[PDB]
Design a protein around this ligand. Structure first.
Ligand SMILES: COc1ccc(-c2c(C)nc3c(NCCNC(C)=O)cc(Cl)nn23)cc1S(=O)(=O)N1CCC(CO)CC1
Ligand SMILES: Nc1nc2c(ncn2[C@@H]2O[C@H](COP(=O)(O)OP(=O)(O)O)[C@@H](O)[C@H]2O)c(=O)[nH]1
Lengths: 467, 162
């Protein structure tokens, strides 16, 4: 009864459920929890979908059979849910196949699956164009052909809500680098739904310049030009398309960032970070929901020809202005946040090509390749913005890191769970070691005293400055 | 225009952090996560026709550096906990060792709403208050009767450097 006691208490959440499901060898508990999944809010359980599906594949049939009923139910009440399952099911198997074929089958998704295939197809073709600008022009043309098929039964799973895609402002699309299988950013027009699953696809509305501009300014320009723009139903979305890059590690980092965000949210630590949504489509390819009002450090330095501090003063005002001190504050909090993330996940390959700066002054790390077992920099440019090593704002940066560390420890188990389950039957480079998760736990330093942690924060920072 | 750095000091529990959230975010909370080291918060006001911005720092291990460059310090005790008032003597010997010898200080009795639990009489405090060179007031972050007054007083008092 001691087990059942816990499970019937308020303490029981989807987190606890998954932990026992993953670890417990008792078939009576597994089945009991399988049923208990239904009582939880769809949104809360949704977050753990990658974990659940992983268990299904790599764990005992008993465990799968406990998971299956809930999954099928959701798939049956939401094609969005169905889609994400099928995509994840496929990606994480290269046991899976039986359910994947069965889920996509009736128990019509062709429009969506063909829609997605074309986007991938486009990207692969751009490989023959060795320059950024050439790719962009080829993209725009080929995107226009998409428009010929615009009003159709498809949606963007990366969207917070259900909807229909109406229009692609192809002229606005841009390619983000010169690489062989370069990713590309596109803007998409949609009409919001109350529910996709019960609603007729909208009717076509007949077609009658791209420059560097803020997001809200970009919506205006696009809206005024758009056929559907008059409608109140109309909204503009955006996604990045990666045709040849694995996003499974990227997804894992996302969950961790979201958890760490919640941890720091539950506690009262004013660290700042920005998780960006991830969509695994294959082990090859995925999509990303981009941050608006932000651009790379590298390009910030190429148009301004300035140093980071100089750019802040130009773009916000002198250190005596409110806008600057606010921006500085947003900078410092975002630096401490991402430092901790980099350390905990052991993120490498850190350079100014991989750090974005938003319009409020936050920095944002993006490339979570090279983490954990697979084998962060505090440059003086960064230290200058903080007012220098003797600066109060810099001292605060160190203060936040400690605070955010103490917070993380209080919820350590929530974090490791996400990673430890994912390691299952895994061939991801981040799991190459024998002790990937074990080393991860050591990095929380649960044994350390706070005085010891103060010292550890200092040690971390000294390392971060050498470059 | 100006930039005034102010610190909040006192025994743990006296109410510094809620004072800060009331005055700067007009927010209060009964549930409390302990402050690890230091916080600031900022809000701008006008005194005698001039736009000022106040930077308040809410403070075991003690980096004496944060005391540096503070024009004003609010020294707070809990009216309902005599010991917190008792340690006000030890909190003033510290501040003269590690802080500007010509700094504006306000003594603050917080939680004045707890009338029936009062352990420190207003007269005894203000007596000690004007017996020394500190300005004095009692606040309730909970009811927020004297919180605005306190800052604007000390900030006005401060600007009085010329
Ligand atoms: C997987 O790596 C990421 C990660 C994040 C983003 C991203 C998000 C979520 N949001 C934005 C973003 N926001 C600006 C949106 N503009 C608007 C809406 O006006 C601008 C930019 Cl460059 N990246 N980005 C893009 C890519 S990437 O694969 O495309 N590639 C990787 C290689 C280089 C890394 O350094 C350049 C970026
Ligand atoms: N009754 C009452 N209690 C307060 C008031 N302000 C703070 N407290 C309580 O006393 C504690 C003291 O403030 P705290 O947030 O710990 O900041 P610290 O005292 O500087 O560490 C708070 O956690 C509250 O529970 C108030 O105005 N009235």
């Amino acid at each position: 009864s001691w087990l059942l006691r816990l499970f019937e208490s308020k303490l029981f959440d989807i987190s606890m459920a998954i932990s026992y499901l993953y670890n417990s060898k008792e078939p009576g508990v597994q089945a009991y929890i399988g049923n208990r999944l239904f009582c939880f809010r769809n949104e809360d359980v949704d977050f753990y979908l990658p974990q659940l599906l992983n268990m299904y594949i790599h764990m005992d049939e008993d465990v799968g059979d406990a998971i299956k009923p809930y999954i099928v139910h959701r798939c049956r009440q939401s094609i969005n849910f169905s889609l994400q399952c099928a995509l994840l099911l496929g990606a994480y198997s290269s046991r899976g196949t039986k359910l994947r074929k069965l889920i996509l089958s009736d128990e019509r998704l062709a429009p969506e699956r063909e829609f997605i295939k074309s986007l991938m197809a486009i990207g692969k073709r751009l490989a023959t164009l060795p320059t950024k600008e050439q790719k962009t022009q080829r993209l725009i043309s080929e995107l226009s052909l998409l428009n010929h098929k615009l009003p159709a039964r498809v949606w963007l799973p990366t969207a917070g809500f259900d909807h229909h895609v109406v229009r692609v402002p192809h002229t606005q699309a841009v390619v983000l680098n010169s690489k062989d299988k370069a990713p590309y950013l596109i803007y998409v027009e949609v009409l919001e739904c109350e529910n996709f699953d019960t609603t007729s696809v909208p009717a076509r509305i007949p077609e009658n310049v791209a420059l560097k501009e803020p997001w809200q300014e970009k919506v205006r320009r696009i809206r005024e030009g758009s056929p559907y723009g008059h409608l109140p139903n109309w909204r503009l979305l955006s996604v990045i398309v990666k045709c040849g890059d694995d996003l499974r590690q990227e997804l894992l980092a996302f969950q961790v960032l979201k958890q760490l965000q919640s941890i720091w949210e539950q506690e009262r630590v004013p660290l700042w970070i920005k998780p960006y949504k991830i969509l695994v489509i294959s082990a090859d390819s995925g999509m990303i929901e981009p941050v608006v009002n932000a651009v790379s450090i590298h390009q910030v330095k190429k148009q301004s020809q300035l140093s980071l501090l100089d750019y802040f003063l130009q773009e916000h005002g002198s250190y005596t202005t409110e806008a600057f001190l606010s921006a500085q504050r947003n900078f410092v909090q975002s630096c401490a946040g991402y430092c901790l993330v980099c350390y905990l996940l052991q993120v490498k390959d850190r350079h100014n090509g991989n750090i974005l700066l938003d319009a409020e002054g936050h920095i944002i790390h993006i490339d979570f390749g090279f983490i954990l077992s697979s084998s962060f920099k505090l440059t003086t440019e960064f230290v200058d913005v903080m007012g220098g090593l003797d600066g109060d704002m810099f001292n605060y940066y160190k203060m936040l890191m400690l605070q955010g560390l103490i917070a993380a420890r209080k919820h350590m188990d929530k974090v490791v769970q996400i990673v430890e389950i994912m390691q299952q039957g895994s061939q991801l480079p981040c799991f190459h070691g024998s002790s990937t998760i074990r080393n991860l736990k050591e990095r929380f330093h649960m044994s350390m005293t706070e005085e010891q942690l103060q010292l550890l924060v200092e040690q971390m920072v000294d390392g971060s400055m050498r470059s | 225009d100006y930039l005034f750095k102010v610190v909040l000091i006192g025994d743990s529990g006296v109410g510094k952090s809620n004072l800060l959230s009331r005055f700067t975010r007009n927010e209060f909370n009964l549930e409390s996560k302990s402050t690890i080291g230091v916080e600031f918060a900022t809000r701008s006001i006008q005194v005698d026709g001039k736009t000022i911005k106040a930077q308040i720092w809410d403070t075991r291990a003690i980096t004496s550096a944060y005391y540096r460059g503070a024009v004003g310090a609010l020294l707070v005790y809990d009216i309902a906990k005599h010991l917190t008032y008792e340690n006000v003597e030890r909190w003033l010997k510290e501040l003269r060792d590690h802080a500007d010898s010509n700094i504006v200080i306000m003594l603050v009795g917080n939680k004045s709403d707890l009338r029936h639990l009062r352990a420190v009489p207003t007269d005894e405090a203000r007596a000690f208050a004007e017996k020394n060179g500190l300005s004095f007031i009692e606040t309730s972050a909970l009811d927020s009767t004297n919180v605005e007054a306190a800052f604007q007083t000390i900030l006005t008092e401060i600007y009085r450097i010329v």
